[PDB]
Scaffold this active site. Structure first.
Site, PDB file in Angstrom:
ATOM      1  N   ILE A   1      73.030  46.564  24.914  1.00 34.78           N
ATOM      2  CA  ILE A   1      72.593  45.169  25.002  1.00 34.78           C
ATOM      3  C   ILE A   1      71.949  44.855  26.374  1.00 34.78           C
ATOM      4  CG2 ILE A   1      74.273  44.381  23.251  1.00 34.78           C
ATOM      5  CD1 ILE A   1      76.124  43.574  25.634  1.00 34.78           C
TER       6      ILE A   1
ATOM      7  N   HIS B   1      73.100  45.354  18.195  1.00 32.33           N
ATOM      8  CA  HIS B   1      74.169  44.500  18.724  1.00 32.33           C
ATOM      9  C   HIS B   1      73.663  43.285  19.528  1.00 32.33           C
ATOM     10  CE1 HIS B   1      77.905  47.267  18.419  1.00 32.33           C
ATOM     11  NE2 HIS B   1      77.660  46.621  17.283  1.00 32.33           N
TER      12      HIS B   1
ATOM     13  N   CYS C   1      72.594  29.163  19.933  1.00 38.21           N
ATOM     14  CA  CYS C   1      73.270  27.876  19.952  1.00 38.21           C
ATOM     15  C   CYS C   1      74.324  27.879  18.869  1.00 38.21           C
ATOM     16  CB  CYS C   1      72.289  26.717  19.789  1.00 38.21           C
ATOM     17  SG  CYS C   1      73.051  25.080  19.949  1.00 38.21           S
TER      18      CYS C   1
ATOM     19  N   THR D   1      75.367  59.661  22.883  1.00 39.61           N
ATOM     20  CA  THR D   1      76.460  59.478  21.914  1.00 39.61           C
ATOM     21  C   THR D   1      76.454  60.733  21.039  1.00 39.61           C
ATOM     22  OG1 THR D   1      77.352  57.932  20.198  1.00 39.61           O
ATOM     23  CG2 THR D   1      74.930  58.045  20.377  1.00 39.61           C
TER      24      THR D   1
ATOM     25  N   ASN E   1      73.644  65.136  24.463  1.00 40.03           N
ATOM     26  CA  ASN E   1      74.734  64.451  25.178  1.00 40.03           C
ATOM     27  C   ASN E   1      75.381  65.302  26.299  1.00 40.03           C
ATOM     28  OD1 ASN E   1      76.939  65.876  23.278  1.00 40.03           O
ATOM     29  ND2 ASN E   1      75.712  64.638  21.878  1.00 40.03           N
TER      30      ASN E   1
ATOM     31  N   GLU F   1      78.477  66.160  26.436  1.00 36.09           N
ATOM     32  CA  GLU F   1      79.482  67.016  25.793  1.00 36.09           C
ATOM     33  C   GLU F   1      78.854  68.303  25.257  1.00 36.09           C
TER      34      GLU F   1
HETATM   35 ZN   LIG Z   1      70.909  24.058  19.636  1.00 38.34          ZN
END
Ligand SMILES: [Zn+2]
Length: 257
Positions: free
Chosen positions: A104, A120, A128, A212, A237, A239
């Site tokens: 994000i 996400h 809102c 990942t 990755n 790993e």
């Molecule tokens: Zn609003």
């Protein structure tokens, strides 16, 4: 082998890249997962919930303001750049490259990724709670009451901001309480995003998993159903099916050259 994987990469007309927390951690991003899944007296899993925002929106805002503000000093790494440059080149060839991510922090956006599916949401997007409008927000701080707030250290006094002084909707005659446009714990993904996602996975002829793996969330929702179609998957990755060990900022410039 990297040599055999590049044979596929040249032939591949639709590449799907699933980007994990690792791509973000390599840029020094506080990934609030695992050992670092803490902000003061609480765990990130305790703050990122609809119930936590309902009881204490100011505390959840202090935590999300901190996350927005740590990004100031963060730059896109060699992995992000290699991914962005790849999508540009193959784009001029009439071929497709798309990035699916649960990060994000927008470092793929700052890098230059266009076909970016952020399953996400974003730290720099609001919603809102009253009118439902989604808006881009990069303002620092998000509101004047959060000036100098959101310190990570435990014991730090709660800013204790009244709801009216927290981020509010700038739409005419709304003034509703804003929330970050991020998927919280126990919240579903947007059905429009998942439709787009399932469409990508169904049409791709090569799939990559970076920062990942196919056995951990969210790649486990996407990379295995791709492998089941007999589409080559290449994991990258710290790993067919490929595995390239090491930091993605080392392995991806070579692989996507
Ligand atoms: Zn609003």
């Amino acid at each position: 082998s990297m040599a055999d994987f590049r044979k596929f990469f040249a032939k591949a007309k639709h590449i799907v890249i699933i980007s994990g927390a690792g791509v973000s951690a390599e840029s020094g991003v506080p990934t609030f997962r695992g050992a670092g899944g803490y902000w003061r007296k609480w765990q990130a899993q305790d703050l990122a919930t609809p119930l936590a925002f309902a009881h204490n929106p100011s505390r959840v805002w202090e935590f999300y303001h901190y996350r927005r503000e740590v990004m100031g000093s963060k730059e896109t790494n060699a992995g992000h750049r290699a991914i962005a440059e790849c999508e540009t080149r193959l784009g001029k060839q009439g071929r497709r490259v798309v990035v699916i991510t649960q990060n994000i922090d927008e470092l793929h956006r700052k890098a230059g990724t266009k076909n970016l599916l952020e399953i996400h949401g974003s730290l720099f997007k609001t919603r809102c709670t009253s009118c439902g409008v989604v808006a881009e927000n990069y303002k620092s701080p998000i509101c004047p009451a959060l000036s100098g707030k959101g310190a990570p250290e435990p014991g730090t006094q709660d800013a204790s901001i009244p709801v009216e002084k927290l981020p509010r909707c700038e739409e005419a005659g709304c003034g509703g309480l804003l929330r970050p446009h991020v998927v919280w714990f126990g919240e579903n993904l947007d059905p429009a995003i998942l439709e787009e996602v399932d469409r990508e996975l169904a049409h791709c002829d090569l799939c990559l998993v970076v920062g990942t793996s196919s056995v951990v969330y969210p790649a486990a929702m996407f990379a295995p159903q791709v492998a089941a179609r007999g589409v080559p998957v290449a994991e990258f990755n710290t790993e067919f099916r490929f595995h390239f060990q090491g930091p993605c900022g080392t392995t991806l410039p070579e692989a996507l050259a």
